[PDB]
């Protein structure tokens, strides 16, 4: 069902693709998996720590 | 550490087949100018001299 | 944490913290009005508020939502933000369980809280005399007198440093006083949003709690 | 810390020399070539030894 | 060498045509000017606002729905264009009930609203708003605490970007007395700012600055 | 006050200066080392991942 | 913010350490990046890349009347840096009866170093080689052998962090050169700065 989802789009079937690099401008190697991945911040912060 | 190991057994491992094998450098420096430049594979069966 | 419609109907008035419903002639004289809380403080120093949704002249059903609270959404739970995610190791950065960022992260206002943090500052009498929250204070230069008032309470919505003087008090030791004023904790700025008095009966109240008092007052006659 | 390791043969001993070096440089003394980095320097340069800071100390002693 | 031609498939989104150019000098050269785009390009944005009906950022005001601050962070999505200038106020005025867009505001003649369809808040009830806000210009990004009397003036943070994301990817060009040659192509996608060949006689500007350290 | 020759002080008066690096539990007798410390921005402590 | 700069620390004969004073956090890493493609991709050289040798007629692992084969002495030949005048291509020869400064002198090609030697002389064996200059750009993979164009032998970059009085933290570019000694390094870098800028200045 994820792999028809991804089909649906305009979107590759593994899920992963290649992306170049920011700090030279080359290709990689292997390619990596992008997506979108819900976070969230704790209250653990630094200024109650220091 | 997880991340040094890893590059290090990526880089220091061979196939069957890639690109630029067969021939011979000179020393480490020719390898230095002859892989940033991409002519070469990172990994290749190629007989230098050190 | 969120208010539901007990009895739906139209939409007469509404307002940034206050909802105004009109019951139909089905579920039925008295109209029902809601009170969304504003920024207050929570039990972990953490801002909470309730911001509606809904729009005028809209016909509502019983059960439906009207305003999400804290980290809410539309009728689901929704407690962060979506970023993207690209699994491979930079430069070292992401070492053992390390976690890299962007600049359109921080510059985009997503992931910056509203904390609330609670200041109070008493006055009793000791075998001496009591104690009095007057602004003539010595030791005082003028870069922190502009901010206090006549009352010696600091204006609402005045923006202030860390370490500065809030809550003007004098205790007497034996003309030769000792300051004993309410400071700011270091590293923490921001505006001060509410300032609430409780005096004892008996005693006559100054100018910023009669500020209070006819604020209390008229916003009470106006609901 | 690695060149001071050849000149002498106890850890403690060479603490305890640089210790008596650093007393010395803090009052005013000329040095050889922070005090610490430069009571190293001495150290493996194989100027300092013990007879030396007895010889510095006697001094102190005698012109205090 | 030959001057960069430029194709228009979208008002907001351009894209340049750079050939030809030598062995190694297409990748190096597109992502210079990628960096040079995304690091520093000077713009326009919203700097601290004064409003008169409102004490700070976190009250309750008449007339206006379901947000104060929201109405803050909705007035930094707006685009600014100014010719010969720095320093410009504003002020809007609007009364009754309906939406309030960014094209309602009272502009001067050389400031100029870019998409002023965009919604910033809703008026429920007839009342009043007027809020002065400022404009300045500068390079990079400076937060609300870094640039910095009076109560009833309201910071807020400046994060200026005339382009959003600038993309690029080389081909095989074809010319006869020669075996390879690189071309390339730029996507440009702007914030309906700047131009995109303005955006890259800009960086192109920038970048020869910066490389006259060694000559 | 925080004037600009705080920092040049600060930034002077600790060359060679080390100082001492604990983690609060503690098993071996490597829990406590010593580093020549930088100024860095930020409130977090830098350590070397080995 | 333009720096000053280049700080120039030659501490051998045929390496400099160019330290640049900081920029803006961005533009430290960018120009190392660019330069370390730019004087590779872009700086012409001249190198010897076909050798005749009369010994070895086809095969290149059966040599006799030396101290090593044949692929020693190619191996230790395709390294010596060559600096030639305008002319394109030449064709040079040898007879010794071996240093590199030891070889056939010509008003067009000079060699710059003297010392490093290929080979050494076995009983008194008279050996002679033919070689061959082409004018490059980079580096060109296959008696036929590889003939490294670029003057530089290799390139690296840094980004360290320089501390100011004012700002929080901004990057300052170190590049690490070891040219072959048929060009300056300051001027390799003046050399890569001039065609950069002219490669940015068609806009």
Not at chain 1, 28 to 50: P, S
Not at chain 3, 178 to 198: E, W, Y
Request: aromatic share 4%.
């Amino acid at each position: 069902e994820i792999k028809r989802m991804l089909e649906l789009a305009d979107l590759p079937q593994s899920g992963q693709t290649q992306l170049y690099d920011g700090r030279t401008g080359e290709a990689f190697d292997r390619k990596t998996t992008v997506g979108y991945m819900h976070y969230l911040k704790l209250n653990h912060l630094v200024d109650d720590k220091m | 550490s997880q991340d040094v190991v890893l590059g290090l057994y990526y880089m220091s491992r061979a196939l069957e087949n890639k690109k630029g094998e067969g021939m011979v450098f000179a020393n480490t420096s020719e390898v230095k100018r002859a892989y940033d430049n991409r002519v070469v594979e990172l990994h290749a069966k190629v007989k230098v001299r050190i | 944490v969120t208010v539901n419609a007990l009895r739906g109907g139209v939409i007469e008035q509404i307002d940034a913290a206050r909802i105004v419903v009109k019951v139909n002639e089905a579920e039925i004289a008295g109209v029902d009005i809601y009170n969304l809380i504003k920024y207050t403080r929570s039990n972990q120093n953490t801002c909470i508020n309730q911001r509606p949704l809904v729009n005028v002249g809209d016909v509502i059903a019983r059960g439906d939502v009207l305003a999400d609270g804290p980290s809410t959404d539309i009728g689901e739970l929704a407690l962060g933000q979506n970023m993207l995610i690209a699994f491979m190791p930079w430069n070292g950065y992401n070492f053992e369980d390390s976690i890299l960022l962007s600049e359109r992260v921080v510059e985009e206002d997503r992931y910056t809280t509203i904390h609330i943090e609670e200041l109070t500052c008493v006055a009793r009498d000791t075998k001496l005399g009591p104690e009095e929250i007057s602004a003539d204070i010595p030791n005082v230069s003028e870069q922190a007198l502009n901010r206090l008032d006549e009352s010696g309470v600091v204006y609402i919505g005045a923006e202030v440093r860390a370490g500065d003087i809030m809550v003007g008090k004098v205790t007497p030791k034996g003309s030769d006083v000792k300051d004993s004023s309410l400071r700011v904790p270091p590293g923490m700025d921001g505006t001060v949003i509410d300032v609430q008095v409780f005096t004892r009966d008996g005693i006559e109240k100054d100018k910023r709690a009669r500020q209070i008092e006819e604020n209390e007052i008229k916003r009470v006659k106006k609901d | 810390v690695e060149d001071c390791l050849e000149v002498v043969n106890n850890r403690f001993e060479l603490v305890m020399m640089a210790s008596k070096r650093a007393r010395q440089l803090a009052n005013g003394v000329q040095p050889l070539i922070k005090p610490t980095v430069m009571a190293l320097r001495e150290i493996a340069a194989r100027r300092i030894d013990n007879a030396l800071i007895d010889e510095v100390e006697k001094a102190e002693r005698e012109r205090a | 060498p030959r001057g960069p031609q430029i194709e228009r498939l979208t008002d907001n989104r351009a894209k340049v045509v750079i050939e030809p150019l030598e062995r190694g000098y297409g990748h190096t050269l597109g992502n210079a000017l990628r960096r040079v785009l995304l690091s520093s390009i000077p713009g326009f944005a919203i700097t601290e606002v004064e409003i008169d009906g409102v004490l700070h950022e976190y009250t309750t005001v008449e007339g206006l729905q379901e947000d104060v601050l929201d109405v803050l962070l909705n007035l930094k999505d707006v685009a600014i264009r100014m010719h010969s200038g720095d320093s410009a106020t504003l002020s809007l005025s609007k009364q009754g009930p309906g939406t309030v867009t960014a094209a309602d505001i009272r502009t001067d003649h050389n400031v100029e609203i870019i998409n002023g369809d965009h919604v910033i808040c809703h008026l429920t009830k007839d009342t009043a708003l007027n809020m002065r806000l400022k404009i300045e210009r500068g390079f990079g990004y400076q937060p609300a605490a870094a640039r910095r009397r009076t109560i009833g003036r309201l910071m807020l943070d400046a994060s200026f970007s005339p382009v959003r994301r600038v993309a690029y990817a080389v081909e095989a060009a074809r010319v006869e007395q020669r075996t390879d040659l690189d071309k390339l192509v730029i996507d440009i996608e702007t914030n309906g700012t700047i131009d995109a060949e303005e955006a890259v006689r800009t960086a192109a500007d920038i970048l020869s600055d910066q490389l006259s350290v060694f000559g | 006050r925080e004037e600009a020759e705080v920092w040049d002080i600060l930034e002077e008066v600790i060359r060679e200066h080390p100082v001492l690096l604990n983690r609060a539990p503690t098993l071996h007798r490597l829990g406590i080392q010593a580093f020549e410390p930088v100024l860095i921005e930020g409130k977090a402590i830098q350590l070397h991942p080995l």
